[PDB]
Design a protein around this nucleic acid. Structure first.
Ligand SMILES: Nc1ncnc2c1ncn2[C@@H]1O[C@H](COP(=O)(O)OP(=O)(O)OP(=O)(O)O)[C@@H](O)[C@H]1O
Ligand SMILES: [Mg+2]
Ligand SMILES: [Mg+2]
Lengths: 33, 146, 395, 105, 118, 55, 83
RNA sequence: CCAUAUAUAUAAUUUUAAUUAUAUAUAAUUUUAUAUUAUUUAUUAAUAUAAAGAAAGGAAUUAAGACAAAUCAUAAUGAUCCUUAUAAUAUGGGUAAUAGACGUGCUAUAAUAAAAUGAUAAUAAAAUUAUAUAAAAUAUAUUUAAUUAUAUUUAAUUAAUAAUAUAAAACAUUUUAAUUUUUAAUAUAUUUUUUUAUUAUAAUAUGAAUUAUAAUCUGAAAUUCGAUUAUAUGAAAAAA
């Protein structure tokens, strides 16, 4: 097997969260708020 | 070879190699030691010998060696025939007697008890001489079975 | 012998059987004749130093008839020349553990004794920081006084110093203390000391009630600060214990640990050190010495400029106030160097003459080999390790 | 002033001993996203460091505690042979050998 | 390959004991010693460790003729002291090969094989 | 240590804003460690092998 | 022998240790708090206490929830669980 | 074949541990010389003394008989039995119950021994980190700080790089019941961190089971039945 690190010198210049919103905007949770 | 180093080698031709350790003191400290705490055993022994020196003002190591040689029995009856003892076995017997005598004293520190016991032995005051005499007397009584 | 080994060798009078030797006597006036020689202290020096507590346990003093000292060019002579020459005489003796900081301090004490100076020695300041003697809040002095320790210290100041010298100082104020002398405690309730009639000796002999004893201490120090006819040497051994114990073991009525500077003794010590208390003589000096038994932290090296100030170091390991006080008074360090091989030769020679060396070393070993071996084993010149390699290495 | 503000705001990502600011990102599924994210963070850091109109943080010293804790975990062999112990007089000296010189001809 | 002193007159040797290793620079001198840049009594608190370190120099009666710059790592105090002892002996052979036999007789040129074995 | 806590709070807030970190000076439990926890469902589910094997 | 609330103490006993040893509700920190309140220094021993100080300790301990009262509270917790 | 010692190669000596790493090769199953003992008479063996050596350990590797083994969980085959149930699923419960008896381990029963403290940080090895690891900091317990335990926030590293993790005993100081062998008041001293005089002055400051209260941790869930912390409690355990 092989691992390669590349060093490139350069000039200077969420699944849970998207479900928590869906649950909170559900009737089961929206009714308590 | 260079001449300076040839001279060094000639000078060391006659000199005996110094001893790594004192075998008798090594034996005694290893008999004090438990749990591989050698430094503690060496501290106890050296502190006791320091007290011996300070109270007798003589080489305490020599006093300890004279004490062990005199106190230890030369032979001992075993199951009943007398058998001779080597130096290490003699030192073990004598040291056990010395420690038993020292643990009858008052100081909390074992070094103080041992040191003043060794001072008393160095001045010819010890009950273990009676133990040595009894062992020798039994050996004489059973000399016929050697 | 019922104590442990250290207390036995400190208190069992084991030197009763030490062979006398006629050493030359310590005399900084005649330093040239005693330089690089083992000397004894004078009789006067011995009395004063014993009362001061210049000698300490675990110094192997019991090996010899009396405590002795090698007069060292690089430690004794150098330090004392600085002590006589420097304009601001405020020193911290430093160096590795067992190097000879306390012995150098005692040589300074002996110099003071023979120089007609008054010595106030706070040896081992753990007595007033460990919470093992009483304390009480004084309302006039906004500080926690410690009457038991003050009684002991005032007796030490009286006993150590030359009575005629200490009587030379006339009091500069009037003082009134509670009378606690048993004979006239009832007939006379207050002892009174007048200006130009009673002396500092009279004040220093006052018997007062414990709650008032703190004021007596102030009365003493103030007096010695105002007089200009006698130099005052103020010495503190194991000063490191003060720098690394900013909060004592005492706790106030609210159960909070008391700051060391809220104690009268802490305030007194750091006032003398910081220069807040000024001694008018001009030959007066302060000599501090660290000890290897105390923990090290950033306070000391920062106060000496050895390392920069790192302001994020926790208070346990860096006390800025002590740095501020030690820098306000221009306290300079004197590092005790380790012994060189010639000094080792002189010390081991004296030890031989005292019949202290083991037979394995003197009887059958070449002298130069012995000196080289013990210079090596002492870590190239540590005096304590030298002694322990001579008298306490039975192996 | 801006360099100091940069280091103060970098906090543990800055190592004063090496002068290296380093940050890593693997929160996005692809390396190109993580690289662009790191570039954008750097831009915000530089913009804030150069904006000294409100606070330059000159009163805040540089905290090196993370670096001290890091250094305690690596053995430090910070010692060199004493300069005054050296004995160049004792070094071996090349001895003349005729054959080699006559062979370099 | 015959060992010799380097450009600074130093004999460099390596010794091992248990999991400890030591690299010593021995130069002619006056019996000075540093271990990991620290004074001998600072680094080695046990006297017997210092005696172990000194023993090879004492064998050839050359304590006081050599400066030792020892550097250790691994294992504990005893292992490090005895790896320094071994390294010093090996380094000392270079200064005078005729003494090797005597050092070999002292036991300081023999690498101690013993190690922790479950 | 002598640095006022307001200065360090300002530093912490500004740094957290720069690096997209939750700044929670009150120390309230936010459940943020729940959000940041990785999904281990795939590795756990592939334990017995790929079911779509040729039979 | 000094007596506090009908408890005897050898003279050499350290107050902060002795109080925590002999009184039911008192522990190490509580005993140290009492000693701090009464101005006793950390390692003061029983034989050094004056009778006024003994009475002050007695009053301070009586204002505490200790001995029979605390034991009754504990037994009441156990009994209420048993119910 | 490991290990050990050495040589070569490799590393742009910042993935640093070059005192290292791991490939290849070498080495020993050591050898020589005398002296004394014996000898199947030396060209033998042992002991001792010399000489050269770094040289001193370990593992694996074949068959044949005998007996045991169905958590034989070291299988396979066969036989036999159940097939609405001896198969299968869910919820809760149990495997943790307590009179005894015994095996093993841990913590103890104190002074050759326990405790506390020790920041330019005494001194390791071998492992682990993509189904993680958790640095520093901050906050609370909590008391100037430190220590310890949680919380907040997740820096770096998926690793000779960063983290788990400043190894701990050691060593030094201080303390320690039994112990009037102590503390304290006065004097006292050329022992001053101390001496002396006169006065007063069987379970602990060992042990940490059990129990109470309040918190915390993991988990959807800690009741039967988990772990941790704080304040209390403070049992048995001494002799042979
Ligand atoms: N100049 C000297 N002459 C003779 N003996 C000395 C000298 N200096 C030190 N010693 C002895 O060496 C040992 C060192 O003790 P000392 O009290 O002087 O050390 P220290 O540096 O003050 O120690 P610590 O770090 O413990 O405070 C003691 O035996 C002391 O007697
Ligand atoms: Mg000192
Ligand atoms: Mg306990």
């Amino acid at each position: 097997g092989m691992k390669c690190n590349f060093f490139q010198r350069s000039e200077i210049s969420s699944a849970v969260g998207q479900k928590v919103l869906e649950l909170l905007d559900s009737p089961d949770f929206k009714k308590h708020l | 070879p260079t001449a300076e180093q040839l001279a060094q080698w000639e000078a060391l031709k006659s000199v005996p190699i110094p001893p790594r350790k004192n075998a008798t003191l090594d034996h005694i400290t290893n008999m004090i030691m438990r749990h591989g705490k050698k430094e503690k055993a060496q501290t106890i022994l050296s502190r006791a010998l320091y007290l011996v020196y300070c109270q007798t003002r003589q080489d305490p190591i020599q006093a300890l060696e004279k004490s062990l040689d005199e106190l230890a029995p030369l032979m001992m009856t075993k199951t009943v025939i007398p058998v001779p003892l080597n130096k290490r076995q003699r030192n073990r017997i004598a040291w056990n007697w010395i420690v038993q005598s020292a643990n009858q004293r008052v100081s909390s520190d074992f070094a103080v008890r041992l040191g003043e016991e060794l001072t008393a032995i160095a001045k010819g005051t010890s009950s273990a001489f009676e133990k040595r005499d009894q062992i020798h007397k039994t050996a004489i009584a059973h000399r016929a079975y050697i | 012998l019922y104590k442990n080994w250290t207390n036995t060798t400190h208190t069992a009078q084991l030197q009763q059987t030490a062979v006398p030797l006629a050493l030359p006597i310590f005399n900084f006036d005649d330093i040239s004749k005693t330089l690089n020689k083992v000397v004894s202290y004078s009789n006067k020096q011995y009395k004063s130093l014993h009362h001061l507590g210049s000698f300490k346990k675990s110094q192997f003093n019991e090996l010899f008839q009396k405590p002795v000292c090698l007069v060292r060019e690089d430690a004794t002579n150098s330090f004392l020349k600085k002590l006589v020459s420097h304009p601001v005489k405020k020193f911290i003796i430093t160096g590795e553990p067992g190097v000879g900081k306390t012995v150098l301090l005692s040589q300074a004490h002996a110099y003071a004794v023979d120089s007609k100076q008054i010595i106030i020695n706070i040896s081992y300041p753990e007595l007033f920081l460990n919470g093992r003697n009483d304390f009480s809040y004084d309302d006039d002095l906004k500080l926690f006084i410690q009457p038991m320790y003050l009684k002991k210290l005032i007796r030490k100041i009286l006993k150590a110093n030359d009575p005629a010298l200490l009587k030379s100082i006339e009091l500069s104020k009037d003082y009134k203390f509670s009378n606690a002398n048993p004979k006239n405690a009832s007939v006379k309730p207050f002892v009174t000391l007048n200006k130009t009639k009673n002396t500092v000796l009279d004040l220093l002999s006052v018997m007062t009630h414990p709650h008032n004893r703190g004021k007596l201490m102030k009365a003493i120090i103030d007096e010695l600060s105002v007089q200009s006819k006698v130099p005052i040497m103020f010495t503190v051994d194991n000063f490191s214990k003060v720098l690394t114990t900013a909060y004592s073991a005492y706790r106030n009525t609210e159960n909070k640990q008391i700051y060391s500077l809220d104690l009268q003794m802490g305030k007194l010590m750091m006032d003398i050190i910081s220069g807040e208390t000024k001694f008018a003589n001009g030959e007066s000096s302060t000599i501090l010495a660290i000890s290897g038994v105390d923990r090290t932290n950033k306070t000391l090296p920062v106060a000496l400029g050895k390392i920069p100030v790192d302001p994020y170091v926790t208070r346990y390991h860096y006390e800025p106030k002590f740095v501020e006080l030690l820098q306000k008074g221009n306290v300079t360090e004197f590092e005790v160097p380790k012994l060189n091989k010639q000094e080792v030769n002189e010390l081991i020679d004296y030890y031989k003459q005292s019949n202290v060396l083991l037979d394995k070393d003197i009887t059958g070993k070449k002298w130069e080999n012995l000196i080289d071996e013990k210079y090596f084993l002492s870590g190239n010149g540590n005096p304590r390790e030298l002694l322990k390699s001579l008298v306490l290495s039975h192996r | 002033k801006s360099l100091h503000k940069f280091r103060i705001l970098a906090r543990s990502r800055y190592d004063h001993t090496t002068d290296i600011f380093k940050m890593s990102s693997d929160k996005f599924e692809h390396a190109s996203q993580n690289a662009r994210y790191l570039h954008d963070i750097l831009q915000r850091l530089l913009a804030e460091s150069k904006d000294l109109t409100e606070d330059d943080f000159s009163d805040v010293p540089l905290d090196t505690r993370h670096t001290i804790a890091k250094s305690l975990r690596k053995k430090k062999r910070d010692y060199e042979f004493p300069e005054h112990w050296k004995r160049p007089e004792d070094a071996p000296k090349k001895k003349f050998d005729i054959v080699d010189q006559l062979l370099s001809t | 390959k015959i060992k010799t002193l380097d450009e600074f007159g130093r004999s460099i040797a390596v010794g091992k004991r248990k999991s400890s290793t030591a690299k010593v620079f021995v130069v002619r001198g006056t019996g000075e010693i540093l271990v990991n840049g620290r004074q001998l009594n600072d680094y080695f608190l046990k006297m017997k460790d210092r005696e172990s370190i000194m023993y090879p120099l004492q064998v050839i009666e050359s304590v006081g003729k050599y400066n030792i710059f020892a550097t250790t790592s691994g294992g504990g105090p005893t292992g490090q002291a005895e790896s320094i002892m071994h390294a010093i002996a090996k380094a000392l052979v270079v200064f005078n090969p005729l003494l090797k036999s005597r050092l070999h007789k002292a036991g300081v040129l023999t690498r101690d094989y013993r190690h922790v074995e479950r | 240590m002598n640095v006022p806590k307001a200065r360090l709070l300002k530093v912490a807030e500004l740094s957290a804003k720069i690096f997209d970190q939750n700044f929670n000076p009150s120390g309230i439990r936010t459940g943020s460690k729940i959000l940041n926890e990785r999904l281990k469902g795939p590795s756990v589910a592939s334990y017995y092998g790929n079911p779509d094997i040729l039979k | 022998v000094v007596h506090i609330l009908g408890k005897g103490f050898k003279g050499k006993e350290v107050i902060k240790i002795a109080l925590a040893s002999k009184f039911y509700g008192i522990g190490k920190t509580t005993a140290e708090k009492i000693c701090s309140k009464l101005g006793f220094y950390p390692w003061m021993r029983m034989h050094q206490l004056s009778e006024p100080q003994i009475m002050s300790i007695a009053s301070e301990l009586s204002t505490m929830t200790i001995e029979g009262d605390a034991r009754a509270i504990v037994k009441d917790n156990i009994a209420l669980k048993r119910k």
